[PDB]
Subunit: 330 residues, 3 copies
């Protein structure tokens, strides 16, 4: 009657979301995989349900007696040999979960999505929940997957009155980055001195604990059918590495490749594929999309939810302090 | 009773075919998906039906009262980040549409397929509808998708009495190339003096209005179960570029890369994959297939349907003009 | 119920299976695909059921009156342009087949899997049936495919009482390598003097007929539910080539690339991908997995089954002769 189910709780975001809910005193049930590793888990007094999103039979048991569902992705950019197969399984998995929660009579669903599902501006002014997005401008399987999944949730919200509120975190950094996420691995390589080169670009960094808190705020004050960007700070990658290096007491990376220098590679790529009669993975048309800065505003969640992200330097600082104490810099 | 249905009408080939059928006085229904840009369409006075091939349930309404179906590929050679997923949708969609059309009692189906579904020769004698082809000779997802789709149409002709005539256009060029098409893009790069190199290739260029006409002609004179190639001119790529440059009044590109110089990249490609335990995208064997000239004959369509295509010059000349009037070039 | 059924008999590994089953006086029936060139079923005394693992309906017929089933994948490491689609087809073709075998009352099933489905050691001690594996450790699609299909067969064994014994060959070398197999290609490139360089790995080479023997020996002495490695010799790739070259009467390749030299290539690949916003196909984590020697122990098949394979030397010798006689060597 009173159970909060969170999925993806072994992940970086999932577990931080779980901790927040716990300190707010929800009764937790955590869906985990048959495989799965309960390491940043045992910390939580929590019911554990075992299940798997691709098979709707194991989900009803887990959603019995559940009032509130937080759907958080199991991983965050987990590399795989089969990316197209993973995108189908993740899109369908989300659909099964959403339909199952609907069927079990869950009252409120908070769906964790991502800025990767959202649109971009070209003039370098930060994008928001209103920026138009089209399938034809999405560039990789990671983003395409987040885009398709988010579109599924919006279809179910409209066609079937799914009581879902959507959250779109930017790129979370912070302590407890166990696998390291890709952004963690970059911060680690850099803090360690072993990152000689990099390709410039723009991203938005957000403390993982702020993402977490923002999920709780969406449950408390968010409106069914709305998306809310959960960003922190719009930062260039060079500036990020400047901060990492200054905090870690090390030399910043020597080599900065401008994105416009990838143009020739794009061109060669188109010529190789043509010459071989295959599809290029990368083209000039590809580069012109990925050139855009990934800059987002969190103003909608600021006004509408009282979301208060701490600055990017705080997230980077904690992530490094944690990496040092936990042996990751060796 | 008497409606003509046309899919892919927003695309380059689809809308030409649509226009041709209107000057012939057919009543048009356009199968369309929900976000489709309505801009290429407006000039037609057509019923629009929103429907999605991947799903049988949506098609029966779009087929009520339809005497004639033109199934034209939604896109032409559109790069995607999920080529295999799109292949599944093209192949399954075409099956669905074809079953739904049997179930709705459609009297004629013109199926738009491509020379990419057909077999190639190695003596540089132009191939035709008769050239043998086997699934294992086909080297990219794009050609494989078209080969498999056509096989399905052939199966349903043979097993379920599907009343389909098949049309196999070569590579269409001309006005109204809005995206543009990858070939229009080569036209553009070349016309403006920024294609410094190209890999020698041979292909077959057809005026996009000849493809559209050929489609109308196949309905009026073609026999159920027959494939007809709708080509124009077989031309080497360097000759196509020398022609483009002369028309645009610039210097031809002067760096022509032989295909055989790709060997060492194909070698390095196999060894790199082996060293990383993955599948190479490109092998020595791929390269032997890519070598073959995409030369084709339209003799069957000229003799059986009256098809009278124009030279490549007209196609390229018309493309450049349009590109000029609508600001893609000077 | 008299007939021994074998799929993939047209394959390199099937062609060896039948041969050995003739030598044993099983009454054989060979499942065989409508296309597939029937070259190795040629003068075998066998029934000729035509079928396709993709749909259950061609199977009910071919299975009827069959006591013993050997399921051998027909394509050994076949490069394709659609590898994830092929993995789906191989997993489901195996599920279908196994379900049809239940129906038909088959007593014993011999499943051909592969060491690719198994775990690997980091220390370079040969791994065995017992070595732990998880999905996330798995490096390429071929491996993933083999892994998933076996995880399927293990499920049917467990929960539906599939009467299957599992066999895991290492890498087959010998006569009748038609495509060839990627390894056969490496033997041709080597035997002809066309291999300047190679990356150093370890491999387990097994005479293709010893794999055949192993299949039969598994039938006659092996427990339901158990796996059996069917290997030969663990050798470094370099020694393999010295071996191929001496037998070919040619100079060995003299460029041996260390595995650790790919590390900057992995790095470059991660950066180009980040810059182009696509998923890297190869990363430092990939490289760490693929560094491991593909080394395996056959002790279990030796003890439970009296498997006694020959040295790798014989395999290479049988294979080169075959190549020479069929006119594929310079
Ligand atoms: Hg997320
Ligand atoms: Hg650094
Ligand atoms: Hg077409
Ligand atoms: Hg040019
Ligand atoms: Hg096998
Ligand atoms: Hg060699």
């Amino acid at each position: 009657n009173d159970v909060t189910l969170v999925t993806g709780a072994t992940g970086f975001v999932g577990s931080a979301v779980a901790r927040v809910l716990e300190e707010r005193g929800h009764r937790l049930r955590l869906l985990v995989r048959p495989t799965s590793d309960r390491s940043n888990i045992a910390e939580l007094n929590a019911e554990l349900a075992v299940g798997d999103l691709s098979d709707p039979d194991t989900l009803a048991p887990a959603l019995k007696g559940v009032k509130i569902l937080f759907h958080v992705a199991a991983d965050y950019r987990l590399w795989v040999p089969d990316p197209e197969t993973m995108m189908k399984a993740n899109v369908e998995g989300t659909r099964n979960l959403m339909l199952a929660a609907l069927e079990a009579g869950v009252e409120k669903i908070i769906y964790c999505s991502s800025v990767a599902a959202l649109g971009l501006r070209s003039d370098g002014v930060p994008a928001d929940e209103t920026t138009p997005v089209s399938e034809s401008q999405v560039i990789g399987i990671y983003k395409l997957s987040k885009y398709r999944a988010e579109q599924e949730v919006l279809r179910l919200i409209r066609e079937k009155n799914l009581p879902a509120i959507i959250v779109n975190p930017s790129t979370p950094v912070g302590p407890r980055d166990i696998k390291p996420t890709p952004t963690g691995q970059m911060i680690l390589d850099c803090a360690s001195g072993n990152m000689p080169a990099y390709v410039e670009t723009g991203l938005n960094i957000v403390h993982v604990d702020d993402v977490a808190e923002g999920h709780a705020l969406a449950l408390e004050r968010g409106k069914i059918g709305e998306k809310y960007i959960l960003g922190g700070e719009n930062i260039m990658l060079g500036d990020l590495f400047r901060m990492v290096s200054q905090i870690a007491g090390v030399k910043p990376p020597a080599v900065k490749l401008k994105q416009s220098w990838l143009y020739p590679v794009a061109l060669v790529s188109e010529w190789l594929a043509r010459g071989f009669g295959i599809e290029p993975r990368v083209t000039r048309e590809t580069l012109a999309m990925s050139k855009k800065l990934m800059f987002f505003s969190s103003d909608k969640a600021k006004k509408e939810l009282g979301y208060a992200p701490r600055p990017a330097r705080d997230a980077v600082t904690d992530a490094i302090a944690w990496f040092r104490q936990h042996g990751r810099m060796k």
